[PDB]
């Protein structure tokens, strides 16, 4: 009857949207190459707050299929099977969520981290190019000679020392960068890598849990994954890359390098 339609009916239109919302976000590019991390901040919180909106359509709805169930249909099936449907999209919905939050942290936390090592890099060719000017150009006019006795060797070696701190403070957040670019296709596995779960996965062949340690084997059929637990192929956004990153701590070494060069110089001109 009436009734039933319009349950039906509803229900479709609901699991359409979470269908919808469902390919966004798996084949949602969390790799190297996508920086538009405040968008997808932006987009995020919006779908939250359509989400709180639509919890209550969908609580609605699964009373009305109850309500329907009391009476024994010979649709009873079709609607217990709609019922299950929702709950299970509606639930895998808010773990995606779970891989979206930790996905804009990590990440947003990556690129943070590499800007701040190209700040640091430019910082110390500055310190160059000036080493490079006091020991080069010419030193003869008296105005030269002058300003060298105006300046303060012990307070620029303290400015050396100030940096070897920050430095430091640098290595230690690369310990902690996540991988971004062993996420994209286009990448040469010479291994297999470390993932960290970052939701709940659950089917047949395989189930995972929340900060379940897995390996990547290799892409399946895209935006999945071929993964070791048991063996079988995941969405890639369930899982973190995690440390270490080798590409952020050798940057952070190269600089830590090209820094005592430079103090090395520094005294080399200054005693
Ligand atoms: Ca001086």
Redesign the pocket.
């Known amino acids: 009857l009436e009734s039933l339609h319009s349950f039906v009916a509803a229900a479709t239109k609901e699991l359409m949207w979470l269908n919808e919302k469902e390919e966004e976000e798996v084949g949602f590019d969390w790799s190297d190459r996508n920086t538009n991390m405040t968008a997808k901040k932006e987009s995020y919180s919006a779908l939250m707050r359509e989400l709180e909106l639509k919890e209550k359509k969908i609580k609605e709805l699964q009373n009305a299929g109850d309500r329907l169930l009391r009476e024994d249909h010979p649709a009873r099936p079709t609607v217990e099977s709609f019922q299950a449907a929702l709950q299970t999209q509606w639930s895998w919905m808010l773990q995606l969520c779970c891989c979206i939050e930790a996905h804009l942290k990590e990440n947003a936390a990556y690129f943070q981290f590499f800007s701040d090592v190209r700040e640091a890099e430019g910082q110390l060719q500055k310190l160059q190019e000036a080493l490079r000017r006091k020991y080069s150009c010419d030193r003869s006019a008296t105005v030269t000679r002058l300003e060298?006795?105006?300046?303060?060797?012990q307070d620029e070696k303290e400015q050396l020392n100030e940096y070897k701190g920050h430095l430091s403070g640098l290595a230690k957040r690369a310990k902690a960068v996540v991988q971004l670019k062993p996420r994209h296709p286009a990448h040469p596995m010479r291994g297999r890598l470390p993932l960290l779960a970052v939701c709940d996965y659950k089917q047949v062949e395989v189930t995972v849990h929340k900060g379940d340690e897995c390996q990547l084997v290799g892409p399946a059929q895209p935006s999945h994954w071929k993964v070791l637990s048991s063996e079988a192929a995941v969405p890639s956004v369930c899982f973190l890359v995690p440390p270490p990153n080798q590409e952020a701590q050798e940057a952070v070494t190269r600089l830590e390098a090209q820094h005592q060069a430079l103090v090395t110089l520094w005294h080399q001109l200054?005693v």
């Open positions: 060298d006795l105006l300046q303060d060797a200054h």
